[PDB]
Amino acid sequence: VQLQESGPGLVKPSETLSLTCAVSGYSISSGYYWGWIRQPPGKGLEWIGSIYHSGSTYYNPSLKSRVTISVDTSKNQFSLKLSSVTAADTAVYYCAGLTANWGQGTLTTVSSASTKGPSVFPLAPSSGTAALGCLVKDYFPEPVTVSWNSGALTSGVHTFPAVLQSSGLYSLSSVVTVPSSSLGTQTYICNVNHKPSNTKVDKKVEPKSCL
């Protein structure tokens, strides 16, 4: 059983948020209930609503007039419609259901700012452990994902929380420590993905010529 959210990373204020949850490995009409729960950044969980076996819906009373939850039996998905959104609706949205199974969650940002793809700069190693990394700068909105060597390199990796610059754009760094002896033989590539702007970059990080 797999649940997978899909939807925009960015929504303008007063518009309608629209999300879908693809259910794999299970029939949606065989489910006890299907629902949505959200989590504002750095905060706790808040239940939005659920649709049950009969199709009967129950919504969070503070959100009721803005929420619609329905089911697509042919696509084997259910959805969430949240109208008239404001910055207060910025959160990670999870779909869930009882066969409970949770999805990965998808971050939705409500902002009047626009989508912007990142630039990727190397944090190149130089003068028995060396540190290196990638600076993922000036993007909007969150999130970005970073891996190293297409997943093959995980030990010693630290991908930091993004910081909101005063420009209104996010910046993030991802580093890794490796043996110094490997700098001349091992290739290190950071894999950067910014789905809101549909931007993917594979950046090779090479030792600096320092003197």
């Binding site: 969650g105 944090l123 990394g133 929380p161």
Partner: protein, 217 residues
Amino acid sequence: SVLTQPPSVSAAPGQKVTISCSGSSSNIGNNYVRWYQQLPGTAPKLLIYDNNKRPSGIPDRFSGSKSGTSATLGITGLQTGDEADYYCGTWDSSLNPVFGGGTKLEIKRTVAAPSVFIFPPSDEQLKSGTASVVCLLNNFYPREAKVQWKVDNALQSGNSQESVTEQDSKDSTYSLSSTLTLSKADYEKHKVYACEVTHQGLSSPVTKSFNRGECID
């Protein structure tokens, strides 16, 4: 968030912690309590249901109980990797789900001094008109750390930002990244760029620095 949890709890490896969850008679008072573990970047995972029942896959290090309008999560034999946000949940009087604000668990490992690295801006970025200088503080404990930037011995105040990782799943340490941002023109007006680090595990402050023009490519 409806239920009340403490912001954080902490103890050493192998020890036990308990996490409290306070509600009222209309929720926890009348209804079952469940618990979740949320590791950074992941969805909450069910640890306890029906007050004290463990789902398949959850070790008996985790336990739950309920007394009146409060519930309690117990975690014995604390391990690195147990660091997470923990949530209690129940149903209100309308039988709708409600949740606590969460509790972050910290593992109290031994003091570890940070390894410090500094990165000059890339020529590539310099062509884009800006210079980001990055200082890395790697695998230290505890969290408290002080990073001070100096440019030609001038203390930098207000033009840097930092962020910290969560405790590492393998050694329970933190890491910190600090970025000093200058315009290209400003960057080319100075020589010495230095990051000075203060931490409990260091007998005296450590400084890593470079001179503009030492590195290429």
